[PDB]
């Protein structure tokens, strides 16, 4: 047992004293001089083992690491410093592991409102490795979040920041984390869904994910990207402007193409998106009639999968209930 918590708690005190003296209105503490980055590197690597996590949680090691991340971001901001990014990366990684599978640690971290503002701020960072880790923290916090957690996650503007961040991400590891969090947050409330669509170029990007050539022979990004689209497609149905963006990016053809997929989540997201999209719009209804959607949906009603069986039948319901004039 090494109490690097005490070192970090002591380091944060020095930074807080400095912040009190140097308010919004001389020499600043540097974490290289106290060996903070090697100290947090250890605490990051200890958080993988759940026995050490049990020790960390009683002592208050989540707080201390969240205090460190926060104060460093507050002081130095969006820097490209080797030491300052790595410090935050490991801090976030330890926070990813402390938040994992832990109802209490999710609730506390979210209630630490200053740290959450710092977290969201770091998505505009030029380091995509940090973006990936910050997304990973936000992903876990958005997973099975209590009322207060969900409220604060919205409060801080984490959806808009994640979606904006997602548009400029160039790595697939990063984009996987970013979309996972957005998938979670999309299921929280209707205002989150509204915010995802409110961002410019956002819906267009999400149609792109459906036909995304992955490297590394994996489907996770198409699963999560379409999974987001499915959640928000509820509010897309009542909005004509957004439907037009799906039309012009060949969304519906791809959705019907995804019904023939070997992945089971892809097919599920497709059926749920078509469920929402097949209601209330004559032209998209007629479009799907024309594309052979009715014969495609009839295959999938006898599947041993609650949400493929429901999704296909609920969508097929809407199509048959609003049959076009041509088909008579």
């Amino acid at each position: 047992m090494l109490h690097l918590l005490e070192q970090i708690r002591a380091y944060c005190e020095t930074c807080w004293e400095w912040q009190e003296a140097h308010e919004p209105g001389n020499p600043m503490p540097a974490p290289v001089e106290h060996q903070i980055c090697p100290a947090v590197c250890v605490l990051m690597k200890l958080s993988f083992d759940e026995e050490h996590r049990h020790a960390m949680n009683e002592l208050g090691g989540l707080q201390a690491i969240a205090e460190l991340l926060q104060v460093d971001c507050e002081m130095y901001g969006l820097t490209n410093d080797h030491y300052s990014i790595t410090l935050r990366r490991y801090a976030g990684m330890a926070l990813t592991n402390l938040t994992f599978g832990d109802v209490a640690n999710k609730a506390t971290l979210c209630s630490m409102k200053g740290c959450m503002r710092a977290l969201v701020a770091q998505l505009k960072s030029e380091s995509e490795d940090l973006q990936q880790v910050i997304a990973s923290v936000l992903r876990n916090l958005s997973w099975r979040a209590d009322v207060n957690s969900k409220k604060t996650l919205r409060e801080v503007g984490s959806v808009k920041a994640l979606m904006e961040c997602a548009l400029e991400v160039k790595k697939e590891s990063t984009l996987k984390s970013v979309l996972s969090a957005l998938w979670n947050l999309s299921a929280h409330c209707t205002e989150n869904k509204a915010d995802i669509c409110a961002v410019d170029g956002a819906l267009a990007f999400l149609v792109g994910t459906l036909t995304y050539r992955s490297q590394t022979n994996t489907l996770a990004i198409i699963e999560s990207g379409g999974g987001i689209l499915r959640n928000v497609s509820s509010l897309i149905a009542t909005n004509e402007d957004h439907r037009q963006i799906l039309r012009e990016n060949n969304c519906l053809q791809t959705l019907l193409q995804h019904l023939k997929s070997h992945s089971l989540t892809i097919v599920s997201n497709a059926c749920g998106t078509l469920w929402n999209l097949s209601a209330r719009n004559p032209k998209d209804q007629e479009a799907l009639w024309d594309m052979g959607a009715v014969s495609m949906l009839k295959n999938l009603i006898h599947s041993k999968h609650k949400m493929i069986a429901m999704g296909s039948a609920a969508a097929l319901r809407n199509l048959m209930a609003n049959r076009p004039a041509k088909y008579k």
């Binding site: 993988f48 990684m93 992903r139 876990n140 997973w143 957005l182 999560s224 999974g227």
Partner: peptide
């Protein structure tokens, strides 16, 4: 999206 430990 689910959840996970750090990579």
């Amino acid at each position: 999206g689910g959840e996970a430990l750090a990579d």
